[PDB]
Amino acid sequence: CLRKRIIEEDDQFQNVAANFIHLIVQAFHSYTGNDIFALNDLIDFKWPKYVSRITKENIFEPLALYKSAIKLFLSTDDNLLSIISKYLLIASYICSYLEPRYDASIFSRKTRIIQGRAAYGRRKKKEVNPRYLQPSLFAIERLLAIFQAIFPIALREESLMKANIEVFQNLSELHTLKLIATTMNKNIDYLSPKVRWKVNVPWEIIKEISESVHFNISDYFS
Amino acid sequence: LLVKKYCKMTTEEIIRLCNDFELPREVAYKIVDEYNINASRLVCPWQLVCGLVLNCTFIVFNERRRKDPRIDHFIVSKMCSLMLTSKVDDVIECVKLVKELIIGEKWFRDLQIRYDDFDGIRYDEIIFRKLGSMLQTTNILVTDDQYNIWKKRIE
Amino acid sequence: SRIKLWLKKDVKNVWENLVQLDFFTEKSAVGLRDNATAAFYASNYQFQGTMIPFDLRSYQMQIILQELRRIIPKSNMYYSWTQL
Amino acid sequence: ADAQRSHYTVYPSLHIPFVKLLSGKESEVNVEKRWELYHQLHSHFHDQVDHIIDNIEADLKAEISDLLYSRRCFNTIFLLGSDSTTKIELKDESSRYNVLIELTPKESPNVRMMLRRSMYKLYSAADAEENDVSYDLSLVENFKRLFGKDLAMVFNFKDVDSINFNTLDNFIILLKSAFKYDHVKISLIFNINTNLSNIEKNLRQSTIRLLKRNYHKLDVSSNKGFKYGNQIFQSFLDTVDGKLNLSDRFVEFILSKMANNTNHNLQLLTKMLDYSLMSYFFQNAFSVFIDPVNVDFLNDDYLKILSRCPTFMFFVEGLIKLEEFFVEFLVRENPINGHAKFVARFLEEELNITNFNLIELYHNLLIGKLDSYLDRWSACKEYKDRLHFEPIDTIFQELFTLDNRSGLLTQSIFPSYKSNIEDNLLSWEQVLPSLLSGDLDKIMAPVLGQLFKLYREANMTINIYDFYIAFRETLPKEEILNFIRKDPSNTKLLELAETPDAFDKVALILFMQAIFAFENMGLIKFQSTKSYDLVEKCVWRGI
Amino acid sequence: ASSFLDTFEGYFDQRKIVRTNAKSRHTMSMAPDVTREEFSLVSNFFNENFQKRPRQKLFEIQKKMFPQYWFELTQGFSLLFYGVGSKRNFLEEFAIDYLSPKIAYSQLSIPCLILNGYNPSCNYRDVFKEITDLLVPAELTRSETKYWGNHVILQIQKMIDFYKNQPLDIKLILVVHNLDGPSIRKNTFQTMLSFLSVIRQIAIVASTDHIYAPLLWDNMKAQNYNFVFHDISNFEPSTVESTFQDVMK
């Protein structure tokens, strides 16, 4: 790459190579530590793009070469579902990270013929940020109730959504994709009432899922 | 009348509201008893009497609704002009709400058996509907008696 | 308010290096087994700390903050936060 | 008794399933000809469908091969949206051996077993193509010393999302040690079902830096760009061309049910279309009349059941304001399918637009909203008048139409299963028919349905004795003992009935058989391992 | 004591907090105790006489659906029956008295393998031993056995590749009572049965009893099963399946 760009545009070449190595060290020593292999990887990834910014004006002034090739000394850059399934994952996150006894204070919106009062809610908010810790375990029916509480919609139109074959098939698939876990991992029977359920996705993944369907999950944690 | 709360009624008003919709006396006393057994734990008796009378007049008049689809509109508009309510979502929302508090009860089951309605169809239709029969009837073609009364209209 | 802040994506690598250099260890981990039979039993079991995402794994320190205060030099940048 | 056995075989004692329609007055040869018409249409559909399946499998093999064959790193391929059923075949390199090693999560309990299965597969395949060795990575080291040629290993990891990522990471780092040998080339294939970031958060950063040196993402799902679902729907429309119509509600049902399945769309589409074809040929008596040979076998029942059409209603109302008329309107073609074919061909060829759903396009063309569907592209403003079609209305179309108004497709393929269980248990009039025990059948409900109403009105934790007391109060004490004394041939029953606590004992026996029936069904659970005093309800109706 | 009964609101409403003064701590100790055999006597009478004429009338209604079930089986769909009540007699009489000789006549009986999934001792290896006895599949080659693989699953996949090129004649009828039953709801048994349901030459007639049974099937297993669902509710008392539980407890 280097010689191809010199043709298409020996101590000096050693100078520019050593200056690139020292710039890589000075930019990413706090990231790599004293890992030779990580710095070798970063040098191998960032050498050709740094080569592709070497000009005749840049070949003798290294500060101008550092100014032109600046964006690869700022960041490391070492990287490489249906409607029901997304809402089932959202409801599983809600079930795992909210206490069940506050459920009737949030999603309950139907009018009453019999006299009754809903849950008042939390009297004072806790300062623990529960999404920092491991998720709680929940039952299937609470997950279904929260799923149909927050799923989108004259006399036979069936406004709410029942848990039909498709819902249970999607939940089984979510267990297959390891986006939902149980306490039991081998020889687990799905049908026992002693089997509990938890979500295992990070907060960022469920945020991407919730914003992909334009659902506002961050209201529920405020 | 569905928004105002905390009332107390007598038997005369509810048996008068039965006689608007032309229901027999046993069904009328069943509306009376269903209003009575849920008296002290109720917020709006008007919604309960409205839904009970509507649910019983959608099952007594099942055959006339089959013969004439406008009968469904003549009942939802008779009480919308009686409840002092402009829009039409309140009555259907109210009857959908109160359906969940009556559908389990025994006399509602007996009233469904003795007039053969089952939320719209006879037993010989609903058992094949639940069985998943390919030979169940479908709402693409008109019925035989509808075609006959049309031919009587034309001739 | 009184130094570059790194993002979680880049702090992941430093976290892995700190686990690798035996500064952190997994919570209630047995570690190296005594004999080959118990090690063979442990290799055929899937541990719960290896199936959850890395940001929720429980860890414990091999060095406490008082020992950290003792031999980090007084002129270091982060020395004042070794006291709590 | 074989009912107390776990399994038993039966050799029982010892011509078409199509039944006689038109209230039992169908011809027998009409039934047979309907059977042959269903068979020829179903065969004409599935020949195209299996050809399409062969095409998608061949194209996927070719694309994976072109990625696999295009220094000291892996050749990494991430197959996004992969269900791990793709056959991968390799190229036969001259003076080199190419081996494919498949690894499932069940075959990967730890790194040792993963390496041992990989080296057994490598040694077995190499000796099959060309003394015992130890199944470790020194076989990779001494490969050219035994076999005389160099090695290319293609690892195909199936169901990565289900694998232990610690074990996978350690196996990758273990394979990295084989780069120090000149005769070794390693490729990795990762079948990924969710996305790449969910697996990059699960590996080490050093592993991500290792895999980034030579990697290729390739998004191959079944529901990718609708190139294959539109082919299957077009095959169905070419099959039913000139004989059958599709209602817009049927097509929107197809769209709605296809939206709920992601990994397996095409089998659901074929299943739904097949069941609709079965329902039409099983139900409709005019299925004989989809070909013009059978125009000489119409009777009075056919004229009675073809006269009840709303299109015929509107046509004779317009004429005011039979067999020859019914025969005359078979020559028409209904060219909506040809118009959809032309629109799809135009959009794929002239406008270079491939991201479209022919099922959605057919739905909008059936409604009359093709322009509002085409507005999403902002490239057909100059050709909307060329591409627009008015939906022509055809007489007697209701007798040749695939539709879902009865709820048959919903009950058969995607039922509200638990809701049906709940509705049957709460109602039971719509299940049990109305007609010795005739006096008790009018008064007493079936025991499960009677207990379910008390279950529904109870709270989330039910005291089992108070539940029994309520169930006892629901029963009549007189008629139950009368019905149990109506049989005089049961001496122990007649002895028990004269005891004064017979009503309570009978109620308890029926109640307990219903309680463990509910326990087996999953409605209730017990809040102990040794006590039977409180139950919890697990099932709420309407969910 | 709840304004909402049966929605998500009824679920949240009926999980209120009950005080200890309203706990109603009556137990089953103050219940009329019975002996074991009079339970069986009363159950036999009340299940042989009560609501029996509606049950026989209802069974006469749903026996008209048998040719539709036969059509669905020869078109490649498995039958999953569900509903409230026992389905053992319906499935036995449909498969043995109706389906087997009519399939044998239309293909011109058929061996019917019956699985009792309500039995906890139902083991998939002996079941597959009976399938290998009935269909006699080609044995696995040494390369096909792989490296400590599951021999049943590998053999079934080999039968799938074999039977993909056979005539589409039903040569085995699998009747699975209680597909969601305690030993058969496990993942290996369900995997075995869905891969068996892939084969066109085996007709699958299965039933389920648990209300959460569709949770067993993900997209691969639901594709392999190819289920047409049929609600058969008949209020049968489930006498045979009750023998593997206890009622005195």
Side-chain angles (χ1 to χ4, degrees):
Chain A
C1 65
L2 177 75
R3 276 190 161 91
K4 202 255 288 182
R5 212 195 159 93
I6 306 141
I7 296 301
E8 259 77 14
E9 193 75 28
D10 205 10
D11 208 5
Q12 176 218 287
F13 292 150
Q14 156 73 30
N15 259 253
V16 69
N19 186 237
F20 178 65
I21 288 172
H22 289 92
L23 266 171
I24 285 287
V25 163
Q26 198 237 33
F28 306 118
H29 176 70
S30 282
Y31 176 72
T32 66
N34 292 102
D35 200 340
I36 296 178
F37 297 107
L39 283 155
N40 269 339
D41 295 342
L42 292 185
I43 283 163
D44 276 349
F45 293 144
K46 282 161 195 298
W47 179 239
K49 321 162 172 294
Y50 178 91
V51 152
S52 68
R53 291 193 164 320
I54 290 186
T55 69
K56 293 284 118 182
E57 194 264 333
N58 261 352
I59 197 47
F60 299 143
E61 282 88 4
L63 267 86
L65 185 46
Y66 176 53
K67 283 320 167 309
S68 73
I70 185 62
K71 298 297 289 183
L72 49 67
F73 300 106
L74 305 187
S75 287
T76 36
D77 289 49
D78 52 13
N79 46 72
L80 91 172
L81 318 165
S82 69
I83 173 70
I84 284 168
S85 176
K86 281 160 149 190
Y87 275 68
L88 278 169
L89 254 185
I90 282 155
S92 320
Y93 202 86
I94 287 166
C95 283
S96 265
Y97 285 104
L98 298 181
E99 216 34 71
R101 65 143 281 249
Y102 302 102
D103 268 350
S105 176
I106 302 178
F107 319 98
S108 274
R109 63 192 128 90
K110 293 316 185 312
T111 40
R112 294 161 189 260
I113 300 113
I114 318 293
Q115 316 193 331
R117 313 154 77 123
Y120 311 146
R122 36 181 74 253
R123 255 148 47 175
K124 62 174 187 62
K125 54 180 74 173
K126 62 180 158 38
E127 326 294 311
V128 88
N129 202 309
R131 310 172 256 127
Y132 287 150
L133 316 92
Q134 282 186 15
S136 264
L137 297 158
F138 53 88
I140 277 304
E141 190 88 343
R142 184 200 175 190
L143 165 66
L144 293 178
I146 287 174
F147 166 81
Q148 80 149 336
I150 67 79
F151 204 64
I153 310 110
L155 269 165
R156 311 272 214 267
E157 90 263 43
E158 215 266 317
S159 168
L160 266 177
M161 212 202 172
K162 305 164 169 188
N164 75 320
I165 297 310
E166 309 202 282
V167 181
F168 280 88
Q169 200 184 321
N170 280 305
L171 188 41
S172 210
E173 195 49 50
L174 282 174
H175 186 270
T176 290
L177 305 128
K178 251 85 170 164
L179 310 180
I180 303 294
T182 43
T183 36
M184 259 158 308
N185 322 83
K186 41 181 293 183
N187 212 37
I188 153 201
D189 44 335
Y190 293 118
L191 292 214
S192 176
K194 292 296 141 187
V195 168
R196 284 192 290 181
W197 292 106
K198 68 191 168 185
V199 70
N200 48 330
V201 293
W203 158 256
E204 44 272 16
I205 283 192
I206 209 64
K207 188 64 197 167
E208 190 184 8
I209 278 153
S210 174
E211 289 301 310
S212 182
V213 285
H214 309 151
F215 186 76
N216 197 29
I217 198 177
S218 313
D219 156 76
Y220 289 89
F221 290 118
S222 68
Chain B
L1 255 62
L2 303 187
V3 198
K4 51 162 296 303
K5 308 257 188 291
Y6 307 133
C7 291
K8 178 57 71 176
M9 311 201 186
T10 185
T11 72
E12 264 66 38
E13 209 278 329
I14 183 167
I15 69 171
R16 180 63 184 86
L17 199 47
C18 158
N19 297 329
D20 284 333
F21 285 84
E22 207 255 324
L23 327 168
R25 297 299 292 253
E26 290 87 56
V27 191
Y29 293 152
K30 252 72 100 186
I31 318 289
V32 164
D33 293 12
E34 227 284 330
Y35 162 69
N36 271 318
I37 58 177
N38 302 326
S40 178
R41 50 146 208 151
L42 170 54
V43 285
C44 284
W46 273 123
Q47 314 229 40
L48 196 76
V49 61
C50 159
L52 281 160
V53 157
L54 275 204
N55 268 326
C56 279
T57 203
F58 280 125
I59 178 189
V60 167
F61 290 79
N62 60 11
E63 298 190 19
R64 198 162 87 198
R65 192 170 48 247
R66 276 192 204 120
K67 290 181 184 294
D68 198 12
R70 225 278 183 212
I71 302 301
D72 199 284
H73 284 299
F74 204 82
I75 273 67
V76 75
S77 72
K78 189 209 230 149
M79 189 177 228
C80 268
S81 292
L82 195 144
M83 278 324 226
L84 302 182
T85 281
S86 303
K87 61 182 179 294
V88 301
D89 293 299
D90 285 328
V91 278
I92 48 180
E93 168 259 333
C94 170
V95 69
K96 266 198 164 193
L97 246 183
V98 68
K99 184 31 172 323
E100 85 162 28
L101 305 318
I102 171 56
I103 190 191
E105 304 268 29
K106 175 169 198 323
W107 63 263
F108 194 65
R109 145 169 77 238
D110 275 305
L111 151 69
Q112 281 163 305
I113 290 160
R114 175 231 76 258
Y115 271 9
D116 205 358
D117 182 37
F118 298 129
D119 292 331
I121 45 182
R122 319 142 198 281
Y123 175 80
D124 266 345
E125 301 314 284
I126 205 167
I127 193 59
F128 285 132
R129 217 172 257 198
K130 281 162 161 49
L131 272 169
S133 194
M134 277 161 186
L135 308 175
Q136 64 192 245
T137 202
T138 179
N139 296 316
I140 318 175
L141 294 202
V142 312
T143 52
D144 210 1
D145 46 355
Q146 184 180 1
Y147 178 73
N148 281 358
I149 65 174
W150 166 81
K151 199 118 190 183
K152 287 290 119 174
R153 281 195 296 168
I154 286 297
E155 295 289 323
Chain C
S1 73
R2 201 199 305 158
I3 303 309
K4 183 196 161 172
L5 182 74
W6 296 76
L7 315 158
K8 267 171 159 271
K9 159 228 313 165
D10 264 41
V11 168
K12 196 237 192 70
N13 189 71
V14 156
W15 189 264
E16 270 154 354
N17 301 332
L18 282 172
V19 173
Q20 172 131 295
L21 285 166
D22 205 25
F23 284 106
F24 308 146
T25 195
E26 281 164 87
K27 184 218 201 104
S28 96
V30 165
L32 201 74
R33 258 70 183 189
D34 307 321
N35 53 72
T37 309
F40 178 77
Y41 294 156
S43 73
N44 291 125
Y45 174 77
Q46 308 310 313
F47 289 85
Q48 297 288 336
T50 88
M51 302 175 282
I52 60 169
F54 87 103
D55 53 283
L56 296 185
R57 293 173 187 151
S58 302
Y59 282 90
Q60 290 168 299
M61 304 275 332
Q62 289 268 58
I63 173 177
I64 52 173
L65 194 67
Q66 296 48 63
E67 298 183 314
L68 219 44
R69 186 169 244 290
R70 181 178 306 140
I71 56 90
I72 284 170
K74 304 251 175 312
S75 303
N76 206 238
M77 175 181 6
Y78 315 107
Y79 179 72
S80 47
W81 297 61
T82 45
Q83 195 132 63
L84 171 147
Chain D
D2 43 6
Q4 306 289 311
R5 234 184 280 155
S6 279
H7 56 134
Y8 66 95
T9 323
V10 139
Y11 291 90
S13 294
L14 70 148
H15 262 211
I16 60 172
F18 270 16
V19 312
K20 265 201 180 46
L21 305 166
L22 269 182
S23 278
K25 281 333 306 153
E26 200 178 8
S27 176
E28 175 77 320
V29 77
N30 281 342
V31 175
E32 209 94 79
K33 160 94 64 51
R34 272 170 43 233
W35 177 251
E36 273 46 74
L37 283 149
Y38 168 70
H39 261 194
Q40 61 155 127
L41 267 207
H42 188 258
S43 288
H44 185 258
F45 183 43
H46 277 260
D47 291 316
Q48 297 184 246
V49 174
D50 310 5
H51 262 198
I52 281 153
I53 292 308
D54 162 73
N55 293 348
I56 66 192
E57 87 78 32
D59 301 353
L60 193 61
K61 284 164 83 28
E63 171 24 65
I64 287 168
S65 170
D66 295 347
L67 261 186
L68 213 82
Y69 296 96
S70 73
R71 267 97 61 204
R72 286 312 179 209
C73 54
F74 301 108
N75 174 49
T76 311
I77 280 154
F78 294 99
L79 301 179
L80 285 324
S82 174
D83 80 36
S84 320
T85 53
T86 296
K87 293 280 113 176
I88 290 152
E89 209 219 327
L90 304 191
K91 287 177 168 167
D92 282 298
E93 288 283 332
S94 166
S95 298
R96 202 211 301 173
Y97 186 65
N98 307 81
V99 60
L100 177 84
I101 303 149
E102 279 180 350
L103 278 172
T104 82
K106 179 76 84 163
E107 298 157 336
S108 306
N110 42 63
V111 187
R112 184 194 171 250
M113 275 319 282
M114 264 177 88
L115 182 76
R116 284 177 69 78
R117 287 196 232 271
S118 309
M119 300 301 79
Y120 175 72
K121 169 68 210 167
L122 164 67
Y123 199 57
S124 295
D127 221 20
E129 195 135 345
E130 83 146 353
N131 181 265
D132 310 295
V133 298
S134 196
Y135 298 128
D136 49 72
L137 221 48
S138 56
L139 168 69
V140 159
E141 170 187 44
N142 302 309
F143 195 87
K144 202 180 259 284
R145 302 152 173 150
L146 323 157
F147 291 101
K149 39 160 191 37
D150 43 342
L151 177 58
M153 284 179 284
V154 183
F155 283 89
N156 182 31
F157 301 100
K158 308 168 56 180
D159 311 357
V160 178
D161 275 319
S162 193
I163 216 180
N164 203 276
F165 283 97
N166 180 38
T167 299
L168 180 66
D169 210 294
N170 297 336
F171 185 74
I172 285 156
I173 301 331
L174 203 138
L175 280 183
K176 198 234 286 172
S177 74
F179 293 152
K180 68 149 126 182
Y181 301 126
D182 222 37
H183 66 270
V184 182
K185 197 176 104 127
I186 307 181
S187 299
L188 313 176
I189 297 174
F190 293 103
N191 298 282
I192 271 49
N193 200 7
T194 66
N195 66 101
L196 197 48
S197 300
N198 202 10
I199 95 114
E200 97 196 44
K201 213 179 268 332
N202 273 345
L203 298 188
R204 277 183 288 259
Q205 204 55 252
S206 62
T207 319
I208 297 299
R209 282 192 299 272
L210 216 178
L211 293 175
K212 174 197 191 203
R213 303 192 162 256
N214 182 38
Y215 80 105
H216 310 297
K217 323 142 64 63
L218 182 78
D219 195 288
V220 304
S221 80
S222 56
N223 212 357
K224 181 249 212 163
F226 319 107
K227 183 190 183 69
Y228 305 150
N230 298 342
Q231 276 180 297
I232 294 157
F233 199 69
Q234 189 59 69
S235 303
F236 193 77
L237 288 176
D238 193 65
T239 310
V240 307
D241 216 274
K243 41 211 51 154
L244 290 184
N245 298 307
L246 275 82
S247 75
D248 69 311
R249 297 168 262 120
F250 177 54
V251 184
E252 84 193 28
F253 184 80
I254 294 285
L255 294 160
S256 166
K257 296 296 158 157
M258 219 155 150
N260 290 334
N261 202 326
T262 33
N263 267 136
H264 302 78
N265 276 272
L266 309 186
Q267 216 279 324
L268 204 84
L269 169 66
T270 319
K271 174 177 201 176
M272 260 180 303
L273 294 168
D274 278 322
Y275 200 79
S276 288
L277 207 71
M278 294 171 75
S279 299
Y280 183 80
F281 275 96
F282 196 85
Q283 182 223 92
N284 204 317
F286 287 105
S287 289
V288 203
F289 289 85
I290 70 172
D291 42 317
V293 189
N294 311 309
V295 308
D296 42 350
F297 307 114
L298 79 167
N299 277 35
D300 52 347
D301 295 327
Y302 281 128
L303 264 78
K304 188 249 292 180
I305 211 180
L306 92 97
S307 293
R308 284 194 285 119
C309 284
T311 40
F312 186 76
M313 271 339 274
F314 272 144
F315 192 82
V316 307
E317 266 200 327
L319 251 292
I320 281 303
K321 265 80 172 177
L322 192 48
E323 46 185 1
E324 188 41 65
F325 185 77
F326 177 64
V327 168
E328 193 195 3
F329 276 97
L330 192 44
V331 68
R332 94 280 162 274
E333 286 94 338
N334 203 4
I336 169 152
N337 309 259
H339 177 265
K341 260 286 289 283
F342 164 70
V343 162
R345 167 66 146 80
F346 205 83
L347 256 49
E348 202 265 332
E349 199 254 307
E350 278 97 324
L351 266 78
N352 274 28
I353 298 300
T354 63
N355 180 45
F356 65 99
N357 200 45
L358 195 35
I359 319 193
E360 256 289 308
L361 175 56
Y362 201 79
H363 178 235
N364 294 277
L365 184 54
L366 279 170
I367 299 178
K369 236 68 59 183
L370 177 125
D371 46 305
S372 169
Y373 176 61
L374 282 185
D375 281 338
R376 200 193 141 266
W377 281 280
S378 77
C380 323
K381 304 279 115 177
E382 83 288 320
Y383 277 155
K384 188 213 278 193
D385 193 57
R386 181 188 173 91
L387 261 50
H388 147 280
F389 185 43
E390 169 80 15
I392 172 68
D393 198 17
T394 287
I395 200 61
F396 307 127
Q397 64 173 17
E398 299 115 347
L399 290 152
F400 317 95
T401 293
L402 312 182
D403 197 325
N404 49 326
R405 312 194 72 153
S406 72
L408 171 64
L409 272 146
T410 295
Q411 198 82 355
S412 290
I413 318 296
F414 320 93
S416 40
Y417 170 96
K418 72 188 298 296
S419 292
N420 287 339
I421 292 297
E422 291 161 28
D423 278 3
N424 293 329
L425 267 185
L426 191 63
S427 289
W428 80 257
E429 323 72 54
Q430 320 141 337
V431 202
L432 267 200
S434 299
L435 44 80
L436 175 39
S437 183
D439 54 345
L440 208 72
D441 288 348
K442 301 285 191 182
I443 307 171
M444 177 183 191
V447 59
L448 291 189
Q450 182 83 277
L451 182 50
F452 184 75
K453 163 293 307 293
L454 300 155
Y455 168 95
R456 165 158 187 272
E457 288 162 334
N459 271 24
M460 62 141 309
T461 307
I462 331 170
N463 190 290
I464 185 44
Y465 166 71
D466 316 345
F467 211 33
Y468 161 78
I469 290 300
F471 177 61
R472 179 205 274 162
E473 291 271 359
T474 53
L475 303 188
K477 62 181 300 299
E478 286 92 0
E479 280 59 39
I480 281 181
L481 301 185
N482 200 2
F483 154 75
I484 214 156
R485 286 207 225 99
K486 207 178 288 288
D487 196 7
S489 162
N490 213 318
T491 159
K492 268 88 69 176
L493 272 184
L494 285 196
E495 181 173 11
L496 167 86
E498 287 179 353
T499 323
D501 64 333
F503 174 56
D504 297 343
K505 266 155 161 319
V506 154
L508 187 75
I509 291 318
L510 299 176
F511 180 79
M512 288 323 276
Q513 92 150 351
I515 278 301
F516 303 79
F518 276 12
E519 173 280 300
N520 212 70
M521 281 182 83
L523 306 191
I524 56 109
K525 64 160 198 219
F526 286 117
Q527 269 292 135
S528 169
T529 36
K530 69 190 181 297
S531 182
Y532 302 97
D533 284 11
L534 305 177
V535 329
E536 286 219 333
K537 52 194 296 197
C538 324
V539 182
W540 273 260
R541 193 176 166 275
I543 321 183
Chain E
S2 175
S3 294
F4 318 117
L5 266 177
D6 44 5
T7 68
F8 63 66
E9 313 250 351
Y11 176 71
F12 303 137
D13 202 287
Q14 270 144 347
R15 309 164 76 88
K16 278 161 183 30
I17 312 299
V18 277
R19 312 296 302 195
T20 332
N21 310 76
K23 196 50 76 76
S24 283
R25 36 148 187 84
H26 291 121
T27 165
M28 257 279 150
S29 286
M30 58 210 117
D33 298 316
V34 304
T35 58
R36 189 252 207 277
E37 86 300 310
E38 65 190 335
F39 150 74
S40 165
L41 190 88
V42 165
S43 277
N44 272 127
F45 181 72
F46 251 94
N47 299 336
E48 279 292 322
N49 293 277
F50 181 54
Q51 303 267 13
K52 253 278 217 183
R53 195 28 34 72
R55 266 187 277 140
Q56 270 135 300
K57 170 43 153 211
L58 178 57
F59 176 103
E60 287 319 303
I61 309 201
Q62 56 198 15
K63 217 176 170 186
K64 281 310 136 283
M65 296 271 294
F66 279 16
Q68 179 179 331
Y69 302 154
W70 174 24
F71 186 36
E72 284 151 358
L73 283 164
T74 84
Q75 288 317 292
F77 297 92
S78 303
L79 305 183
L80 193 92
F81 290 100
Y82 71 100
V84 296
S86 182
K87 301 166 270 294
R88 180 174 178 83
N89 301 347
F90 188 95
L91 259 69
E92 195 256 289
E93 147 158 25
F94 162 72
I96 293 167
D97 315 349
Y98 187 93
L99 178 77
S100 174
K102 266 181 234 223
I103 275 185
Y105 285 149
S106 60
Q107 287 164 188
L108 182 59
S109 200
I110 315 294
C112 290
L113 174 65
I114 300 199
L115 265 57
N116 294 330
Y118 54 92
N119 200 325
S121 100
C122 199
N123 160 242
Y124 79 100
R125 293 190 187 267
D126 313 306
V127 164
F128 189 56
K129 267 135 208 153
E130 295 299 322
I131 297 124
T132 52
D133 290 330
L134 291 160
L135 300 173
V136 52
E139 206 31 87
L140 291 153
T141 81
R142 192 185 158 83
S143 164
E144 283 154 17
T145 58
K146 286 163 63 209
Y147 196 89
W148 268 266
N150 196 298
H151 280 200
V152 170
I153 309 297
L154 292 165
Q155 180 115 264
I156 287 165
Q157 287 176 104
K158 183 184 168 75
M159 310 183 39
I160 288 166
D161 323 307
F162 169 70
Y163 279 113
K164 245 143 199 175
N165 320 303
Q166 296 304 121
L168 261 55
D169 316 348
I170 308 300
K171 26 198 82 63
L172 177 54
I173 292 163
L174 234 189
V175 183
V176 185
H177 294 110
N178 289 253
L179 184 70
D180 52 339
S183 284
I184 191 150
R185 73 181 73 169
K186 316 296 198 166
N187 188 76
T188 315
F189 221 138
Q190 295 289 325
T191 293
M192 200 207 66
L193 287 169
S194 23
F195 289 144
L196 281 164
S197 302
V198 172
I199 295 153
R200 273 302 289 264
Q201 287 80 4
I202 315 169
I204 318 288
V205 184
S207 73
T208 48
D209 261 344
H210 205 277
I211 208 169
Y212 278 175
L215 198 61
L216 290 176
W217 312 313
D218 59 349
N219 286 41
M220 197 74 259
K221 278 188 196 115
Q223 182 179 273
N224 286 351
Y225 268 135
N226 195 225
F227 274 147
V228 168
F229 295 86
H230 285 305
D231 178 27
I232 53 171
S233 308
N234 38 34
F235 300 96
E236 307 316 322
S238 187
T239 321
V240 176
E241 304 104 287
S242 310
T243 46
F244 300 88
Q245 304 101 69
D246 197 11
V247 213
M248 306 319 86
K249 65 181 186 184

